[PDB]
Amino acid sequence: SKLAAFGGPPAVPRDRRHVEWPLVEDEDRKAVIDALDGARLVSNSDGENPVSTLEEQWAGRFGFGHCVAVSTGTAALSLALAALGVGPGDEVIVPALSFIATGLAPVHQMAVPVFADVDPVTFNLDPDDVERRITGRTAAIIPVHLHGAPADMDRITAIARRHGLAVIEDAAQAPGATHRGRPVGGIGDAGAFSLQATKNIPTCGEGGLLVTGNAELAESVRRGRQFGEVIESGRERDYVSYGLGWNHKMNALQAAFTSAQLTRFDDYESARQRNVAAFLARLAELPGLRVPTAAPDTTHAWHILRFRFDPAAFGLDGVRPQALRSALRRLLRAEGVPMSQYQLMPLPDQKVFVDRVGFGGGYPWTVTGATGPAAGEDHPVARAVIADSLTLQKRHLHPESGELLHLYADAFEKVWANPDMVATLAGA
Amino acid sequence: SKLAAFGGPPAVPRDRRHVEWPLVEDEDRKAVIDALDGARLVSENPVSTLEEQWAGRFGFGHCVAVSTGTAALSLALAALGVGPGDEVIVPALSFIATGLAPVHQMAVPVFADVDPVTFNLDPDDVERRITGRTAAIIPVHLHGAPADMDRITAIARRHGLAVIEDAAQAPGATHRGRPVGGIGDAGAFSLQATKNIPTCGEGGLLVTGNAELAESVRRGRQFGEVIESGRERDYVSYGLGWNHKMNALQAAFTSAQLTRFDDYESARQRNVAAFLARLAELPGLRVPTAAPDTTHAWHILRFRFDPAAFGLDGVRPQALRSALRRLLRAEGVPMSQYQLMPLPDQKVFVDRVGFGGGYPWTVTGATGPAAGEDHPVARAVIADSLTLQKRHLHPESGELLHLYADAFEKVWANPDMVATLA
Numbered sequence: 082s083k084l085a086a087f088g089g090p091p092a093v094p095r096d097r098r099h100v101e102w103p104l105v106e107d108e109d110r111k112a113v114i115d116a117l118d119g120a121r122l123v124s125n126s127d128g129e130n131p132v133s134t135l136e137e138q139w140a141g142r143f144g145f146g147h148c149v150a151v152s153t154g155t156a157a158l159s160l161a162l163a164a165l166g167v168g169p170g171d172e173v174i175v176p177a178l179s180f181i182a183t184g185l186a187p188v189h190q191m192a193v194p195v196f197a198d199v200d201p202v203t204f205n206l207d208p209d210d211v212e213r214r215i216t217g218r219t220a221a222i223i224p225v226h227l228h229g230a231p232a233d234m235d236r237i238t239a240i241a242r243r244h245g246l247a248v249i250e251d252a253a254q255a256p257g258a259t260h261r262g263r264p265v266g267g268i269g270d271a272g273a274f275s276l277q278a279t280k281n282i283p284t285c286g287e288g289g290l291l292v293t294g295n296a297e298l299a300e301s302v303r304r305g306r307q308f309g310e311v312i313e314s315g316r317e318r319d320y321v322s323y324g325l326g327w328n329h330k331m332n333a334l335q336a337a338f339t340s341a342q343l344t345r346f347d348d349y350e351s352a353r354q355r356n357v358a359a360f361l362a363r364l365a366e367l368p369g370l371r372v373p374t375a376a377p378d379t380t381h382a383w384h385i386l387r388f389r390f391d392p393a394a395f396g397l398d399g400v401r402p403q404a405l406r407s408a409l410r411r412l413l414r415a416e417g418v419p420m421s422q423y424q425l426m427p428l429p430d431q432k433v434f435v436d437r438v439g440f441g442g443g444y445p446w447t448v449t450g451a452t453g454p455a456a457g458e459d460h461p462v463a464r465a466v467i468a469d470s471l472t473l474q475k476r477h478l479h480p481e482s483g484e485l486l487h488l489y490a491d492a493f494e495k496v497w498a499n500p501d502m503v504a505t506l507a508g509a
Numbered sequence: 510s511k512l513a514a515f516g517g518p519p520a521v522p523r524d525r526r527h528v529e530w531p532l533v534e535d536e537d538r539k540a541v542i543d544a545l546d547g548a549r550l551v552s553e554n555p556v557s558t559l560e561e562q563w564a565g566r567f568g569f570g571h572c573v574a575v576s577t578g579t580a581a582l583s584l585a586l587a588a589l590g591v592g593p594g595d596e597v598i599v600p601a602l603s604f605i606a607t608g609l610a611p612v613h614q615m616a617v618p619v620f621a622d623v624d625p626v627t628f629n630l631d632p633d634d635v636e637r638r639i640t641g642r643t644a645a646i647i648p649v650h651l652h653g654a655p656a657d658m659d660r661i662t663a664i665a666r667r668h669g670l671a672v673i674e675d676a677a678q679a680p681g682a683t684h685r686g687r688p689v690g691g692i693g694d695a696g697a698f699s700l701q702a703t704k705n706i707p708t709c710g711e712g713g714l715l716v717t718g719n720a721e722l723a724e725s726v727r728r729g730r731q732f733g734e735v736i737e738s739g740r741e742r743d744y745v746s747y748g749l750g751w752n753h754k755m756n757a758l759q760a761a762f763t764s765a766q767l768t769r770f771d772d773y774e775s776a777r778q779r780n781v782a783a784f785l786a787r788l789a790e791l792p793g794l795r796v797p798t799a800a801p802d803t804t805h806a807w808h809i810l811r812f813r814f815d816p817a818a819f820g821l822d823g824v825r826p827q828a829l830r831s832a833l834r835r836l837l838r839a840e841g842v843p844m845s846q847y848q849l850m851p852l853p854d855q856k857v858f859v860d861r862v863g864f865g866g867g868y869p870w871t872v873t874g875a876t877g878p879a880a881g882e883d884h885p886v887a888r889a890v891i892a893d894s895l896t897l898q899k900r901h902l903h904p905e906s907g908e909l910l911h912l913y914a915d916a917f918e919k920v921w922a923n924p925d926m927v928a929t930l931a
């Protein structure tokens with residue numbers, strides 16, 4: 082059939098396009114209602130409560146020694162850094178391609194983020210570029226399991242242990258993913274998860290989880306999330322603040338909702354993994370289309386699908402890849418495929434990291450007089466990946482999205498059947 | 510009848526002691542479920558709806574909904590340019606959050622002593638604590654009593670300081686007829702489940718008349734990004750931000766609570782007035798009061814006890830405090846403390862480690878022992894005071910507070926036993 086962009090029928094009819102996420106069932110509604118009526122609405126509520134219940138269930142499902150429920154994935158990262166003694170005068174190596182929270186977490190704990198370039202295929206921090214950027218000030222590495230792909234934990238943990246650095250996994254985008262059969266989050270000193278409403282195991286709003294095998298680390302995060310106070314069910318409180326703490330408490334209602342979601346997680350995983358595999362198998366046949374992949378000895382959570390497009394496949398060798406990216410985005414959106422970008426620039430190009438003002442007076446950079454790259458200066462692979470890639474977000478997460486992803490594949494095949502029109506749009 | 514502490518019948522029967530707070534009605538449950546089914550869980554969304562309603566109800570130019578009252582305070586400081594090398598004067602008697610908010614923005618908290626009757630920061634002591642590094646004052650409307658905002662704003666104008674009201678415990682409170690939170694450069698509210706206008710968990714509101722201050726807080730709460738409805742997220746950040754976002758479900762719940770606030774507030778004011786009227790007649794019992802030309806929110810009721818009234822001259826006030834707590838609790842009155850020590854005594858402010866390496870204190874060179882005087886009023890108030898929390902907030906607690914007053918009058922009818930225990 083003809084391209085929608087030139088008057089043909091869209092591959093994805095409008096009545097098929099909408100996807101509900103989070104997927105709210107009666108079990109979720111009842112969990113929320115029971116949390117309201119339970120009269121234990123806060124983390125610090127004495128006795129059994131939905132927050133401690135989620136901590137136990139998450140730890141149990143993923144085999145973690147300790148789980149500390151917190152306000153956000155960002156708070157999980159910053160509290161992990163605080164617990165591991167990272168702070169003023171320390172550097173933390175993070176990927177140049179991530180959600181900004183990965184770069185901000187070090188700043189939040191008054192440490193300096195140092196950006197390492199990513200791998201052109203995995204989109205994860207390249208251990209080859211991590212080694213280059215270690216200094217006398219480096220205290221920690223935050224590998225991100227970006228888009229749901231576990232990072233090269235062999236080489237990241239090897240680098241950290243060779244240099245005496247801490248490892249905090251940013252596993253926000255990769256719940257249930259494994260590296261050498263180990264649940265992500267449990268491989269580093271600590272692991273951070275986001276339960277934000279867009280995530281693979283969402284809450285009805287905001288939420289975070291910190292996991293660790295280290296009891297002392299867990300206890301530090303437990304104090305840190307509640308103004309530095311010890312709060313233990315049954316134990317007598319002393320209302321002492323033992324050190325720097327915040328209000329990073331998770332909501333009981335959100336905890337109860339995620340507990341309900343977690344009971345169905347692997348049923349949804351089964352559907353997602355089948356649906357995405359079938360979708361990527363069709364796109365993998367299209368020349369100049371690189372489907373995302375799990376690295377060796379890993380599984381992919383498929384939180385975000387990022388595709389790279391080769392101009393050479395459309396005879397556009399020499400033309401800015403961004404021209405092809407824009408042409409494909411326009412044609413696929415006309416078919417009803419909600420192709421997006423995820424990050425328009427590497428994190429080091431963000432004003433917060435370029436300006437190095439931070440809290441004011443250049444802190445945390447001012448502690449050591451540490452500098453960073455100017456905008457556009459470094460991280461060519463992160464730039465190359467952004468230049469030629471489009472993403473699919475949300476729609477593939479729903480267990481009933483099988484037929485929708487086949488309609489998306491119909492759209493991709495239609496566009497690829499009209500390479501002359503792709504080339505024309507790209508060249509205009 | 511004999512005292513409950515020695516086998517007597519309690520003035521408050523066991524089956525009448527329970528009080529539900531927050532007060533959850535079907536309207537609250539429906540609001541939460543409707544927000545859930547609405548499929549707009551992050552922040553034509555419940556968060557912006559609450560912002561509009563709060564601003565409209567209490568007459569503020571701007572309202573920015575955030576995760577917590579603590580985040581409202583720290584984002585306010587950031588918005589007002591408070592940071593490394595700056596000092597923020599806060600009360601020596603408050604919730605820890607008031608002292609931590611400056612540390613969260615890499616500024617140094619400086620503790621001013623409080624008033625022996627209002628329990629709010631003493632403006633005269635604030636003036637004595639001012640240095641070349643002072644950038645802001647956080648007056649707290651502690652327990653629901655508005656602070657001395659005339660003197661605090663006068664001091665701030667003289668020294669070019671920002672004023673951030675900590676109105677966490679004082680929703681609906683007024684100062685010279687003006688809603689608290691709108692007098693300083695900005696005002697912080699907590700919607701935490703224990704509060705007079707609660708959410709089902711955690712929540713905060715930042716209010717201000719200044720559009721630029723509001724916009725700073727709006728960006729600060731969401732990683733420094735500008736998020737407009739219908740616009741595709743470009744992830745472009747314009748400065749240092751956090752995840753301080755309020756939950757839509759919590760916002761919807763507080764919107765439902767607001768529809769009954771005026772009725773709940775009337776009940777509380779009537780019930781607390783009647784309760785304190787009876788307790789005020791007991792010698793050596795000082796009931797909490799609103800300062801002249803202010804109204805109290807009555808979030809927490811703090812009572813000061815005078816040993817002189819039980820002829821316990823020589824006996825430490827803490828001894829009378831302990832004796833009265835034991836006897837009143839035995840009768841079924843859940844008398845508590847609120848803060849066991851002034852904030853300056855808290856390990857976090859004593860050790861001055863902060864983020865590590867003594868920051869933020871390292872910037873100002875405040876590594877050694879705290880500058881300026883002790884806080885004898887804060888210590889004296891803690892030494893001789895007990896608090897009632899939660900039970901008086903429920904609009905149907907009229908009869909319960911009647912039984913509390915029975916318990917107080919009963920304990921005061923046994924002064925020999927009080928003196929013996931003390």
Ligand SMILES: CC(=O)N[C@@H](CC[C@H](O)[C@H](CO)NCc1c(COP(=O)(O)O)cnc(C)c1O)C(=O)O
Nearest residue numbers: 153154155180182183251253275276277279742752
């Ligand atoms: C089109 C679309 O829907 N877009 C999403 C974008 C969401 C965004 O990717 C999410 C939620 O902010 N990323 C959170 C996150 C965090 C911090 O967790 P947090 O503090 O709990 O947030 C740390 N690390 C990584 C890798 C993360 O991904 C929307 O606009 O919500």
Ligand SMILES: CC(=O)N[C@@H](CC[C@H](O)[C@H](CO)NCc1c(COP(=O)(O)O)cnc(C)c1O)C(=O)O
Nearest residue numbers: 328577578579604606607675677699700701703898
């Ligand atoms: C017997 C009893 O239950 N008591 C309570 C007491 C709670 C405590 O007073 C509350 C907790 O929310 N006060 C919070 C608060 C904040 C921070 O707001 P936040 O970040 O929104 O919390 C800032 N300022 C002032 C004056 C505050 O009071 C318990 O011990 O939990």
